[PDB]
Amino acid sequence: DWGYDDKNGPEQWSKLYPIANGNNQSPVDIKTSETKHDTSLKPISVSYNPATAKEIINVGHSFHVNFEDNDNRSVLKGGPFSDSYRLFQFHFHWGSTNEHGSEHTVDGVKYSAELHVAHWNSAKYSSLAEAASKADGLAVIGVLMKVGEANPKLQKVLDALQAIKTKGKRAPFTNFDPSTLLPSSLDFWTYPGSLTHPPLYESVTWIICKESISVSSEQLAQFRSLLSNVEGDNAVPMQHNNRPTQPLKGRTVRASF
Numbered sequence: 333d334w335g336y337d338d339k340n341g342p343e344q345w346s347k348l349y350p351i352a353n354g355n356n357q358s359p360v361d362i363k364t365s366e367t368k369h370d371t372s373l374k375p376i377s378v379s380y381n382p383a384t385a386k387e388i389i390n391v392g393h394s395f396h397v398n399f400e401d402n403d404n405r406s407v408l409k410g411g412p413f414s415d416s417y418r419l420f421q422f423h424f425h426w427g428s429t430n431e432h433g434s435e436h437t438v439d440g441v442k443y444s445a446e447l448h449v450a451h452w453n454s455a456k457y458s459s460l461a462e463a464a465s466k467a468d469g470l471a472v473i474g475v476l477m478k479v480g481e482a483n484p485k486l487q488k489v490l491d492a493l494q495a496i497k498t499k500g501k502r503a504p505f506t507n508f509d510p511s512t513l514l515p516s517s518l519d520f521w522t523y524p525g526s527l528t529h530p531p532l533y534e535s536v537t538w539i540i541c542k543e544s545i546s547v548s549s550e551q552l553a554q555f556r557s558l559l560s561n562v563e564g565d566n567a568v569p570m571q572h573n574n575r576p577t578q579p580l581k582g583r584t585v586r587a588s589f
């Protein structure tokens with residue numbers, strides 16, 4: 333059972349998952365003086381149907397908001413992609429204090445949290461299960477979350493957490509368009525990488541937004557008040573779930589701007 337504590341956490345994941353030391357691991361530190369602007373990168377285009385929102389789940393180390401993915405009602409296009417990618421989930425990462433919590437960093441700067449909006453390649457594969465291990469299978473948008481003013485677009489998400497306080501609880505989460513959480517500008521960096529926790533598949537084309545979104549200190553406290561234990565056990569708050577940045581190993585981070 334992998335986790336984020338000292339015994340089962342990121343520094344130990346390679347014992348069970350050798351790809352943790354691979355050549356396309358995520359997240360990374362984006363050094364802006366080493367990024368390569370690419371004129372072939374098209375703008376990011378997201379078109380999400382709020383009717384595809386399905387369910388919110390406490391998965392023990394985090395929580396997930398999942399989406400119906402039987403058709404192309406909610407898709408990501410453009411950027412580095414020729415294929416359409418189908419939305420299936422968004423979630424967050426955070427840290428134990430405000431000074432860190434993001435997974436990606438920019439010129440060494442750590443933000444307080446990070447939003448991940450995940451999609452799978454339905455042009456080429458028939459299911460998330462098939463796509464998840466393919467090099468071109470997944471596309472995740474990452475948004476860095478900077479501590480500051482309370483973000484009202486987070487409100488439905490935050491209000492839902494009281495119904496999924498402990499591990500394994502789930503509840504309907506409907507009529508929600510997560511493009512409302514994205515920053516005003518979709519200028520981005522992109523690089524080939526991986527899932528940021530086990531099974532750590534090197535299957536993700538990352539889209540990291542240049543512009544951050546805000547989150548308040550109290551909103552972050554709501555994330556950290558989620559419990560990793562099952563109902564009835566001693567409460568164990570979800571204090572953090574961000575992986576340290578990993579070596580680029582010769583990869584190039586491209587810039588759309």
Ligand SMILES: NS(=O)(=O)c1ccc(NC(=O)NCCNCc2ccccc2F)cc1
Pocket residue numbers: 448449450460461464465472526527528529530531536
């Ligand atoms: N933080 S993140 O990089 O945005 C991120 C991290 C993890 C996930 N999880 C995920 O994709 N599960 C789907 C796996 N497909 C089913 C499957 C097939 C074969 C073996 C195992 C298995 F579960 C998503 C995004």
Ligand SMILES: [Zn+2]
Pocket residue numbers: 423424425448528
């Ligand atoms: Zn994530």
